[PDB]
Amino acid sequence: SVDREEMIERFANFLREYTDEDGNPVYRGKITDLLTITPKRSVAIDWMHLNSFDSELAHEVIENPEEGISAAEDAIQIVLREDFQREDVGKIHARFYNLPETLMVKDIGAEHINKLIQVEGIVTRVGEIKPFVSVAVFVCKDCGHEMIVPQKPYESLEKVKKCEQCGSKNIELDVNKSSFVNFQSFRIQDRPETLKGGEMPRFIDGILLDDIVDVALPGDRVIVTGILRVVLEKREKTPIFRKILEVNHIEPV
């Protein structure tokens, strides 16, 4: 595998050195598109491009998307700061597309836990759009000490109940110091044309965050990239799990 530290350097290098057939540093381009007036907040990375430049790393984003995606986003921040003189910029998403293999919803199982997968299907439902606290900041009213707690949309809220410093239970979530982003759930299932006779379509529920919410409507057929996550059944007293697709990239077909 590839150490975190090293994974960043290699991403930063891919970002600033990969070129298409005509020689253009395509990802410098995309990074530049973050600075324009109506700017994007993601950099869509074509997996085949990454694989053609550094295949070891390209396979590690599939085996370890959590660390791989995050290293890419740190690289983006570096290139911005160092090549564009831009520290002020916010969170920028590294969104991978065009993976080597495409699953159908019915093919998704336990083998895929915490790996980056690509699914083709049709959107059955979309939820309403709600704020999600991606970074909760809890403040102690007794001593003013702040405790930062990052969150995951598929997991439950990680609270804190004692000030790290003073030990009192007079802690509350501080909304203004906390960081929120838009959240939207959706269901995707197999396309009816790929089903055989009276075979029953399987589905999977997904999560969209930030700039990729509200990109799809029921009926839309899409190709998505995401991390398959698991959470215990609502009982939480069974070793069976519910599966959720944390979306990394999504496009219509």
Q: Site residues (CB under 8 A) for its own copies? A: 109-110, 113-114, 128-134, 136, 142-143, 151-153, 155-157, 163, 165-168, 175-176, 180-183, 202, 230, 232, 236-243
Least distance to its own copies, CB of residue 182, Å: 5
Q: x/- binding map, residues 139-168, to Zn ion, per CB under 5 A? A: -x-xx-x-----------------x-xx--
CA angle 32, 40, 87 (to 5 degrees): 60
Least distance to its own copies, CB of residue 67, Å: 11
Query: What letter represents residue 71's amino acid?
Result: A
Exposed / middle / buried, residue 16 (Cβ in 10 Å: 0-12, 13-18, 19+) = middle
As given in the structure block, the two tokens for residue 79 are 């290139």
Q: Which is nearer to its own copies, 193 or 236 (CB)?
A: 236
Least distance to Zn ion, CB of residue 143, Å: 3
Closest CA to 247 of 151, 58, 105, 118: 118
Binder of residue 13, out of Zn ion, its own copies, none (CB less than 5 to 8 A by kind) = none
Cα–Cα distances in Å, from 93 out to 71, 75, 77, 157, 191? 11, 11, 10, 22, 29
Least distance to its own copies, CB of residue 125, Å: 12
Instruction: Please state the residue numbers annotated as binding site for Zn(2+).
Output: 140, 143, 163, 166
Which residues are part of a known binding site? 140, 143, 163, 166
